[PDB]
Design a binder for this molecule. Sequence first.
Ligand SMILES: CCCCCCCCCCCCCCCCCC(=O)OC[C@H](CO[C@@H]1O[C@H](CO[C@H]2O[C@H](CO)[C@H](O)[C@H](O)[C@H]2O)[C@H](O)[C@H](O)[C@H]1O)OC(=O)CCCCCCCCCCCCCCCCC
Ligand SMILES: CCCCCCCCCCCCCCCCCC(=O)OC[C@H](CO[C@@H]1O[C@H](CO[C@H]2O[C@H](CO)[C@H](O)[C@H](O)[C@H]2O)[C@H](O)[C@H](O)[C@H]1O)OC(=O)CCCCCCCCCCCCCCCCC
Ligand SMILES: CCCCCCCCCCCCCCCC(=O)OC[C@H](CO[C@@H]1O[C@H](CS(=O)(=O)O)[C@@H](O)[C@H](O)[C@H]1O)OC(=O)CCCCCCCCCCCCCCC
Ligand code: SF4
Ligand code: SF4
Lengths: 147, 361, 110, 55, 193, 76
Amino acid sequence: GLLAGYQFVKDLESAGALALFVPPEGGFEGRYQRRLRSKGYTTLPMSAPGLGDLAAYLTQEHGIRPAHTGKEDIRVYFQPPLVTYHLENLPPNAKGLVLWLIDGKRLSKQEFAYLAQLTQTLPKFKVVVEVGGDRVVRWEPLADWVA
Amino acid sequence: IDLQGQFISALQSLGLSHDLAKLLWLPLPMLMMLIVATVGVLVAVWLERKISAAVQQRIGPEYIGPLGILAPLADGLKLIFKEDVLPANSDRWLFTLGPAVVVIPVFLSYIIVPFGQNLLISNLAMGVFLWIALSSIAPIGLLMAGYASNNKYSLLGGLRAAAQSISYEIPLALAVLAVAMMSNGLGTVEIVEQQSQWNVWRQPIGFLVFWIAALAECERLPFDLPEAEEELVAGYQTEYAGMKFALFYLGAYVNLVLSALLVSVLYFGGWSFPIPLETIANLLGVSETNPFLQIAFAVLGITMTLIKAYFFVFLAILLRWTVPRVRIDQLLDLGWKFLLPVGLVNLLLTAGLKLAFPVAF
Amino acid sequence: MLLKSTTRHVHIYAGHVVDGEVHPDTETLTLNVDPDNELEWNEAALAKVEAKFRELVANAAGEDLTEYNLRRIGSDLEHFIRSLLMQGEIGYNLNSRVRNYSLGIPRVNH
Amino acid sequence: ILPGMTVKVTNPNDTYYQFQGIVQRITDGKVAVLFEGGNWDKLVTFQASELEPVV
Amino acid sequence: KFLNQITNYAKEAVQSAKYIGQGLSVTFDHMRRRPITVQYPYEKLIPSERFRGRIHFEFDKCIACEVCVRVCPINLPVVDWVFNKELKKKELKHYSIDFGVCIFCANCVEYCPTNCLSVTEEYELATYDRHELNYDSVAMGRIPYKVTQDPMVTPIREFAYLPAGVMSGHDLPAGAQRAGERPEAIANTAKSS
Amino acid sequence: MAVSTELLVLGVYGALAGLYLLVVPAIVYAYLNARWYVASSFERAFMYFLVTFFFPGLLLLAPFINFRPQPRSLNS
Ligand SMILES: CCCCCCCCCCCCCCCCCC(=O)OC[C@H](CO[C@@H]1O[C@H](CO[C@H]2O[C@H](CO)[C@H](O)[C@H](O)[C@H]2O)[C@H](O)[C@H](O)[C@H]1O)OC(=O)CCCCCCCCCCCCCCCCC
Ligand SMILES: CCCCCCCCCCCCCCCCCC(=O)OC[C@H](CO[C@@H]1O[C@H](CO[C@H]2O[C@H](CO)[C@H](O)[C@H](O)[C@H]2O)[C@H](O)[C@H](O)[C@H]1O)OC(=O)CCCCCCCCCCCCCCCCC
Ligand SMILES: CCCCCCCCCCCCCCCC(=O)OC[C@H](CO[C@@H]1O[C@H](CS(=O)(=O)O)[C@@H](O)[C@H](O)[C@H]1O)OC(=O)CCCCCCCCCCCCCCC
Ligand code: SF4
Ligand code: SF4
């Protein structure tokens, strides 16, 4: 209604995994991320189309192989879990760590269900997934919207 | 109605030193004209961006507001929050003053914009001549913006700007001269009340001269030399960042709504729905103290002023995308070699026709 | 005119910053490690970088003041900064800024 | 409609109308058809209804 | 001597006035035509049939012959094989392509022998972190976007898929075909007389 | 018995204000959103004049309007 309170943060703390439906101009959902960040939660957006199993990238380790281009024969990096490493590097008084996914449309229903289930375990970890859609910034729990 | 009468009377009913009430009323029109000037600036920016898009088979701003209505608001608020820069060896006080000297006298010339009779701030006796005098301070602002810069790029732009704003001040005065010949005077209300049944039909050359000179005030792409991006980067504006640059961005569209309203009042008239309206005695209206008819004719006069101001704003921001630019020397030949001779010729012709046929002049 | 080697988190000039200006000098070789705060610094790491800068400008220089040699010094300073970041003496800023790991991602040293 | 089968497209409102390809992958009800043609094998995703298992 | 100069001046001034009036009329006419703007976020332009978008990779079809690495202009695709010792079969452990370095020339897709590698119509790649552009063997399949199956986009054909004589693709009916007949239709007509 | 013209003029321009910045601007939005891609040249000029005249009213209720394309039936 042209100005929003803090219902978004309450709904995220309740459900755990939301599924935004931002308008396809991308300037009207950043304020909701700012609302999240002002409460104490820290965000980190990582553009879902480009993650692997979503279990090797978020929970376990994974060997990233950079682009050798004729030189520098194949080498692996083993970057740490993109979540367990950011839960340790939270600010002192941090309420949690929510994970923002920009292009959630590219993922599949299986990966959505996985991201929903991952919220219950691993306590200080919420999830927002900008599934594209409606002409107003509406949300809906990510456990729903599937099946 | 005479809202001033009611205001001062109702304010004197509770005492408050009747002579002091007249001082407590000046802010009312002095800020009503500011409001209409700011709305005119927003309208001019929006019209430019949305008409240049239609001319080019395009669509202007549409994701800001419903129709890009909030586009000038966003473009202004951004420039408010922008960090202001002041380069290394530039002067510190002529820098932040150029964009204000180029703006203050453009606002001050709104004293004389009528918008219907008794609907203007203090119809002055000097009227249009005061505007001719006040429009000669902006070259000081451009010389000030150029002299207070360590950038030789922008001093050369300030000079070629201050040398264009003085080239189109003699014909712009020789057109108003021929208008004031017929107008019997200089005050804008007295200039327009000679249209009682339009000066464009009797000054068909002075109209052209006035309009060309006003468009050549470093305003439109016909000329816009200090803003001609390709030949030189922004000229003198190339070093102003925040609100100091928004003062240039703003003092160039108010200087366009002003000229549109002035062409309207000089050659067409901010009154007079074309038929001689005040000869609507056929509805047996006692205009004199008719409580309404007054408000109806007020609205008609405001609409008829805005129609003919919008006509010229439209035509100017249409010529912007129709006429090719001239270098700087084909520009300085319009004034002093075509506009000044034709201005003198129009003045002499109006004089000869006023001396021979004093009726209709 | 200035002669400079400006890259990310290294900015070598050929003048003296008196209050914010630069003023080309022909022998000052100022240095401006990490202006945009891509990394978080310590007192020991900045001292190591200054010492490397000194031993790089003083111990190996009898050559011209072309911009080529300035770039050649800046490249070595930035390789030293990247080595410091690899060993772990410093780290990325993690602040709410752009956060693009320009010197490499965090890995686990296997 | 299973992967590996050769299918054609039956949807008059699509740029790939009456094209023929092979099903590479099916997930979440939607399929992915590979049109081997021209020079570079194209792969586009269709609904399960905009195909026809040509023999 | 002096009259010819003046008649030339008049013939130049009136010509310059007419050639400004004509342009003014042309520009005032231009604002009646429908804008050709393809209002991208809600009017995405449907790509061609050969558009070279993001590469798609079927892990099951890859045999690890590395021709994708060999015909690449920059030898980009990282292929990590191990050569199991059952009889001779190579085993694929990790296939990847840094789309930040990618050139989208599709030489890799042209020379894949097993049709394991293909092009898509995903031109909407953009990230805040380039290290997220290195696609795993799993982040590459991902069932491409298909602009047409989007509830908030009205697809717009480009110039090569519009019927004969049609130039713009905005005010289009719901039954248009590309330009002419396909080969099977022409052969079927030729079959009957 | 407040039939005084001193009150009737207040009523008429209090209604005029609402008509100028609350009522006609919405009609201008509606009309100019309907006939935008089909309007002729003179009609375009008149539409822009309409926006120019009522701009103070168009600004007030601009933030309360969505012109987004109203998601379509996808399966069809
Ligand atoms: C960004 C750009 C746009 C932003 C808008 C500006 C912000 C202000 C928003 C407020 C708008 C509400 C006001 C309602 C308008 C009716 C008030 C009116 O007409 O009042 C008129 C009175 C009249 O004044 C008296 O008018 C009398 C007679 O009229 C005279 O007026 C002229 C002088 O001769 C004519 O020539 C006429 O013949 C002549 O008789 C005498 O002259 C008196 O001396 C004089 O005091 O003045 C007055 O108080 C008027 C003083 C207030 C000025 C505000 C006017 C706003 C324009 C609204 C136009 C609406 C058009 C139609 C709206 C519906 C849509 C179709
Ligand atoms: C204790 C702390 C105190 C601090 C003070 C600060 C607080 C501020 C107080 C509140 C702020 C209110 C601001 C505006 C209120 C409106 C006042 C007004 O209504 O003031 C009325 C004024 C005054 O003029 C009127 O003038 C006539 C009276 O005559 C006298 O009025 C003038 C003053 O004397 C002239 O001198 C005139 O010659 C003189 O005879 C009228 O009948 C009224 O009496 C009189 O008020 O109207 C005019 O000045 C005419 C100018 C308006 C004309 C409108 C045309 C509108 C433009 C169209 C709008 C759309 C534009 C968008 C598109 C634009 C594109 C170009
Ligand atoms: C000489 C004097 C001159 C002085 C100069 C005057 C200066 C004026 C400065 C003020 C100008 C501000 C204009 C704002 C317009 C606008 O916001 O754009 C409208 C847009 C359009 O999107 C909207 O968003 C909605 C969709 S959605 O939900 O946001 O996604 C939907 O409504 C649709 O997209 C669209 O309507 O709204 C937004 O996108 C979200 C921005 C939120 C705006 C905040 C509300 C305004 C509050 C003001 C502060 C009050 C403080 C007290 C409140 C408790
Ligand atoms: S996809 Fe083709 S080119 Fe690439 S490794 Fe497999 S067989 Fe070789
Ligand atoms: S698109 Fe070009 S750069 Fe990328 S893998 Fe194919 S051939 Fe190599």
